[PDB]
Amino acid sequence: ATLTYDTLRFAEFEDFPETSEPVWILGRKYSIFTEKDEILSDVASRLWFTYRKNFPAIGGTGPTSDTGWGCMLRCGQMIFAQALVCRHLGRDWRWTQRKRQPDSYFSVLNAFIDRKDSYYSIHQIAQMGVGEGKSIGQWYGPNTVAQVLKKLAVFDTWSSLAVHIAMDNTVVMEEIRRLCRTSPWRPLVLLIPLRLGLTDINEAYVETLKHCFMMPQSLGVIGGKPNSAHYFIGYVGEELIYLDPATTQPAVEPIPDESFHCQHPPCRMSIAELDPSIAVGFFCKTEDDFNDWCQQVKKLSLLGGALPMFELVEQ
Amino acid sequence: KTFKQRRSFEQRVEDVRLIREQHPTKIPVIIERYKGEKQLPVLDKTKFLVPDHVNMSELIKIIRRRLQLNANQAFFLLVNGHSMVSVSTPISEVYESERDEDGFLYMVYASQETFGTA
User: Fold this and answer.
1) Which CATH architecture has domain B1-118?
2) Are A73 and A140 in contact, with CB atoms under 8 Å apart?
3) Which residue of B has its CA nearest to A140?
4) Fewest beta carbons less than 10 Å away: which of A113, A119, B15, B112?
5) Where is the lipid attached (Phosphatidylethanolamine amidated glycine) (chain B)?
């Protein structure tokens, strides 16, 4: 039956360079040569959130679409969603269009649907953003969306996450441990907003940045090219790999989930084009995971010609 | 107009000469909002005389206070285009390796770029 057809195997990769350079994706290393299926599966499994249209008016009389202004909010949703996926499903979990998915999957996705009731919907984010001094429809930067997600997570008793946003290029281990042992350890979502330069990222940070994607705890990075935010999930050689929210899709009407998965080899852009305003994220399920992450960070001192983007201090 | 545009090179050199002679244990620092930064407020003053023992961590805190910023608002202090390697680093050491030809140590503060499309 299938024998009389040409399955066009790897058609999706006709848009990817066949190099010996390993492909890193949120802490997993792949070989372009023998793991195209694995690479595509991991990328396609990630929850993808793009601009949406025709959803309930935000605040009753606000926008019914976030096209043109919700880009960083969408990138925030994607990195936080990946944290939820790791927390509820595990980093090893993979999505398949056919096979029935776990109920926890629909719960995670549901939390990002464009409706006021969902924990992390565009409605909840934009509205909570007002309290941070951001009007509905105003563009966000990395820290702002991170701060808004931390406040929204408070109400997510299902995930019961500890969200720490390290300011001033400093990660205080004492504060983090105190947070995770409060209300024995709450899975940790660590977000580090950074400004690696004025207009460009100093070459000195490049290798350190790459290594941020090579840790088991890696959630990726949010930032972008000027006027185009992206959720960076890894890299290959000198190019960052990412998911792009700049595509307007109809609000989902049931949940059919094909539109929340980017089933294509990821978009690429040279690391040289990345703007200096970013937020790096890490997920530490247990205290042991956090301790391992701390070790991962310290080991970076072994990077030749590289400089640290942030520093770990005890208190 | 930036500090360097309001005071001439020779004038700045002279400023430093006097201040260093009058306060040998203080570092003359110019701190301004990055020309590309528009979200963070501007300071009523741009010239600071900082005890040389003050570290970047403390400097970041006082400027945040001066700008009346909340702890969760993004703020970065950059020297010669880069972030502070270590926040425990004394301003005296930063001055030593990063000072301008005119004798002043320059710094600009900024938050983060925002994003959106079309």
Assistant:
1) Roll (3.10)
2) yes
3) B114
4) B15
5) 116
Residue-range domain boundaries for chain B: 1-118
Distance of CA B21 to the CA centre of its chain: 21
Name the H helices within A196-313: 203-211, 287-298
Experimental method: X-ray
Residue B82 in contact with partner chain A when CB distance is under 8 A:
yes
Tell me the resolution in Å: 1.9
Q: Say if the Cβ atoms of B75 and A167 lie within 8 Å.
A: yes
Task: Residue A210: count other Cβ atoms within 10 Å of its Cβ.
Answer: 18
Distance CA A31, CA A236 (A): 10
- From the CB of residue A77, how many other CB atoms can be counted at a distance below 10 Å? 26
CA pair distance A185, A164, nearest whole angstrom: 13
| Chain A contacts to B (CB-CB under 8 A) | 67-72, 75, 138-144, 147, 165, 167-170, 193-199, 202, 204, 223-224, 226-229, 246, 275-277, 307-309, 311, 313
